[PDB]
Design a protein around this ligand. Structure first.
Ligand code: HEM
Ligand SMILES: CCCCCCCN1CCC[C@H]1C(=O)N[C@@H](Cc1ccccc1)C(=O)O
Length: 455
């Protein structure tokens, strides 16, 4: 029969909204899910959504005949600089399907062969940085992983070198992108946004949008003028035509796609590598097994594309890190028509859902009682995992287009890290997860003892 869904504590006219007035709102929602279970209602002035945490309900939310991607308020605020790029467009906007059709072949597993050399260029910069540290210097892990993933998508995205390993202070483009993402997420908990106290925030936001547009528009214009052909996504987007409409992307949409890819490289992938190394140093037997694989497979100075594919256990380590701390921690859906969720929760057309991915990934009915343990071997027999239990890359046609790119880079880089260094958790680091667009382990530091294996 139909059930009334639970709701967390209220704040009078503000309803549930003050629960998210915290620097760690996703972690707050995870604790609410632990208390209330697989579904809860969340109300704010002028809005309602429902947070889902169980595979039982999320499998139904993943039914594209019943639910489509919604732009969360977070993505609506990011859309002020990511425009109608793939991540911040509605499925029904012409530019979504057009860009999807044009870009999907450039993001396939086969396409990764063409990006591999560029990925290796930045991975070798990381390895050399760490080889060149003096005794008992340490590594700032999320900082170096962010230098790597941003530079990798800049080089693969539009043949542009941010040169992050040559800097303390990021490239001006990156400082603007980070400040724009901070303003976007900050606005989720800004009570009176038209207060004159925020005139400076708005001025800075418009300045940061201009910095991002000016660099990307200039590179697109420079490439069109030269006629140069490279192994980058920009070459693919200038050349490509959508088979359906017969149209190419216009220069403005190409700029939004580049900004969108750069947001993605900077946040998700660096978080995944940071969490993977955190779990490895906290689980030395797992670290040893992964290091043994890296030594057995990566027999050449430079990893080959085919060797990265052979790092099976490293791939399982990365999936297990995505299980516990999926770095893009939620996505939003709306009901296409009236429908009943799970035989119990009637929804009206337009009703919204949020998928709380870290909670989904803690469903004991799927994973068993050891759900907080870091055990990559739980990915050894993936045909045994029920549908829609593991969703770190989202769902269906609106799933991450970058999944093969992210996993190729992370497997390459983690493999090289484990080949070249022993790691020490020299501070006995206490996990502290900072929330931006994404999740990452703030203040995570290690020491790395070279195995003295030349590149
Ligand atoms: C260079 C790396 C990456 C790029 C270029 C990339 C790019 C994108 C793009 C363009 C989309 C939108 C696809 C569409 O709707 O047509 C997307 C969606 C998504 N990506 Fe990625 N991505 C990357 C890495 C990651 C990583 C590492 C994760 C998670 C660990 C991730 C999680 C997601 C999720 C959850 C969505 C769906 C969002 C939603 O439903 O609102 N991405 N990505
Ligand atoms: C890559 C991940 C992007 C989206 C992550 C969402 C990250 N939000 C950060 C706060 C919690 C989480 C979320 O549930 N927000 C929803 C609902 C909402 C709307 C307005 C104000 C507060 C919350 C939303 O943005 O609509």
């Amino acid at each position: 029969t139909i059930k009334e869904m639970p709701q967390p504590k209220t704040f009078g006219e503000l309803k549930n909204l003050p629960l998210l007035n915290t620097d760690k709102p996703v972690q707050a929602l995870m604790k609410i899910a632990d208390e209330l279970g697989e579904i809860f209602k969340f109300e704010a002035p002028g809005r309602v959504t429902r947070y889902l945490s169980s595979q039982r309900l999320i499998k139904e939310a993943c039914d594209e005949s019943r639910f489509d991607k919604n732009l969360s308020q977070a993505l609506k605020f990011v859309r002020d600089f990511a425009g109608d790029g793939l991540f911040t467009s509605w499925t029904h906007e012409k530019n979504w399907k057009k860009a999807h059709n044009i870009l999907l072949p450039s993001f396939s597993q086969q396409a990764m062969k063409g990006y591999h050399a560029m990925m290796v260029d930045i991975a070798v910069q990381l390895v050399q940085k760490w080889e060149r540290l003096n005794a008992d210097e340490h590594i700032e892990v999320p900082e170096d992983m962010t230098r790597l993933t941003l530079d990798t998508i800049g080089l693969c995205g539009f043949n542009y070198r941010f040169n992050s390993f040559y800097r303390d202070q990021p490239h001006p483009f990156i400082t603007s992108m980070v400040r724009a993402l901070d303003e976007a997420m900050n606005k989720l908990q800004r009570a009176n946004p038209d207060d004159p106290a925020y005139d400076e925030n708005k001025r800075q936001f418009q300045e940061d949008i201009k910095v991002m547009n000016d660099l990307v528009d200039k590179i697109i214009a420079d490439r069109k003028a030269s006629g140069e052909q490279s192994d980058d996504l920009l070459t693919h987007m200038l050349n490509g035509k959508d088979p359906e409409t017969g149209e190419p992307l216009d220069d403005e949409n190409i700029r939004y796609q580049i900004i969108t890819f750069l947001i993605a490289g900077h946040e998700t992938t660096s978080g995944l590598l940071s969490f993977a190394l955190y779990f490895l140093v906290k689980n030395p037997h797992v670290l040893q097994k992964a290091a043994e694989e890296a030594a057995r497979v990566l027999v050449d100075p430079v990893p080959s594309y085919k060797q990265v594919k052979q790092l099976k256990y490293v791939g399982m380590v990365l999936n297990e890190a995505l299980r516990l701390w999926p770095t893009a921690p939620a996505f939003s859906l709306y009901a296409k028509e009236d429908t009943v969720l799970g035989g119990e929760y009637p929804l009206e057309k337009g009703d919204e859902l949020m998928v709380l991915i870290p909670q989904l990934h803690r469903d004991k009915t799927i994973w068993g009682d050891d759900v907080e343990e870091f055990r990559p071997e739980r990915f050894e027999n993936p045909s045994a995992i029920p549908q829609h239990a593991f969703k770190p890359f989202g769902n269906g046609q609106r799933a991450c287009i970058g999944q093969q790119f992210a996993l190729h880079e992370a497997t390459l880089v983690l493999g090289m890290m484990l080949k070249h260094f022993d790691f020490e958790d020299h501070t006995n680091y206490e996990l502290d997860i900072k929330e931006t667009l994404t999740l990452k382990p703030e203040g995570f530091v290690v020491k790395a003892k070279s195995k003295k294996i030349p590149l």
